[PDB]
Amino acid sequence: VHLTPEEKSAVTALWGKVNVDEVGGEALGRLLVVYPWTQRFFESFGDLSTPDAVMGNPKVKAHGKKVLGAFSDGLAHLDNLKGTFATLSELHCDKLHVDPENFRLLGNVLVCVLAHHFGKEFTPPVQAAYQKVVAGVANALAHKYH
Amino acid sequence: VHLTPEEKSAVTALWGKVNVDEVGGEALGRLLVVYPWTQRFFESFGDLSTPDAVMGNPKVKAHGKKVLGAFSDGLAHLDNLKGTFATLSELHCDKLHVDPENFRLLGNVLVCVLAHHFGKEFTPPVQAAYQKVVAGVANALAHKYH
């Protein structure tokens, strides 16, 4: 986004240690648990009745991996998140009717998961850079709403 | 921001009708009245104890005209707000220490003031152009915070 080479490195390097599979299933499940109203989009996933039920739901897990997947690919175009997510931005608007606020909630969930995972390694300065990334991604995703 | 030519004309046409002196005093006064916490920056202005005290305060009125004066100028450089507002941004940050949320609150108050004053002339779509405008200024004023 407006990441400092140093900030760029920090993101880049932490990410290389990330198991997208696991992180994505956890980000998306925590989202459905902490902010229950986000479940309005996943009725078809099944039983989201309990934390246990969300976290275990494989439809959830698999959607999480698909989401982090795309996010992951986006960290490769940090200079053009806008152009990187244009089609996903129109999809989310025009087909899925997802309020961009959701993009923001996930971002924050995402940061809590990384801290959870990397403990010590997820320093204030490393968090600061991730925050700029999640905000940049949500902004790019909301970009084509009309 | 994202102002269509027709949004730019609509902004400009109405602004021609505005009495910046009066609107300035009205918007600032109303801010200190609706979001009393905002009074934290004006303890040298005297009595802000009641609505009349605020609204009628010679100092609040004078400051308001100063703020809307700077704002009117920004309306002529709709192309380069960040540029236009840079020194003011650094000042608000470094000297005044004004949290940028204040700038969004004032934009909203201003939109209510224009609605108050123009009645029906302040059409749904005229308001949409002004919302983009007040958001751009607020962004422009927060750009140099660090």
Add this chain to the structure above:
Amino acid sequence: MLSPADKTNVKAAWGKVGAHAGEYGAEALERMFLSFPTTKTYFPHFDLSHGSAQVKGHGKKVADALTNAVAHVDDMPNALSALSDLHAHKLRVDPVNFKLLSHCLLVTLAAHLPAEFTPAVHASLDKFLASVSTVLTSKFR
């Protein structure tokens, strides 16, 4: 919390709305749709065209609810329980959206009540709308 003053201000200003609440409710929606387009993601099933009967009908519903809260200004949590439940469990509108409508409700009133839309009334109406929103969102989690 709303003070005696706030309550007088709100009953007074809403009093003036009178029979126009319906139209003012619709107007607030349109303003909302044009200025904050993300709000539309909640009405995919609506004709959001200018003068949509759907919007018209929706405006009355919102207005009738506000009128009902003024009527029960001393028991809003109870007077609005049903709507609180609906929003919490069915619609699941993100909280941030409430602030957007409030703002647009304020603009519509300003535009319609020049004489009553005083600094003091503005302040009271704002607090009021915040109160209603808080209620409608109280059961979210």
Add this chain to the structure above:
Amino acid sequence: MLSPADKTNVKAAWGKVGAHAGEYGAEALERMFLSFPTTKTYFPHFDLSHGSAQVKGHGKKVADALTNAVAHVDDMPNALSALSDLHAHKLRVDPVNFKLLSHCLLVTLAAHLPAEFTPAVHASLDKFLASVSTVLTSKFR
């Protein structure tokens, strides 16, 4: 509204914080200053440098009040009256900022209570910080 499970969850998590609360207070502030540089507008009289004794001491201060609120999870309003006053009439911090500190506090706990930071505990703590926020900004106007 905090449920019985929530209060339980909160009491457990904080229980583990223990002698480290001050340190976590401090780290959360540090994380906030860095991630949301606008929050620094309220601390112009502080040395915001890493390991600043001012930040340290304030960290302690914030932690302790949090502690006090867990202890009075049942009577927060009353337990934090003095604090809601200070914030509403003296400090006058914009309400938006309360969400930033809250988040940074979650982040800090996540980073330090791996085993304890489950999805259900995460939820409860969030709701808690939100309740705390509400109390602290209830006398704003």
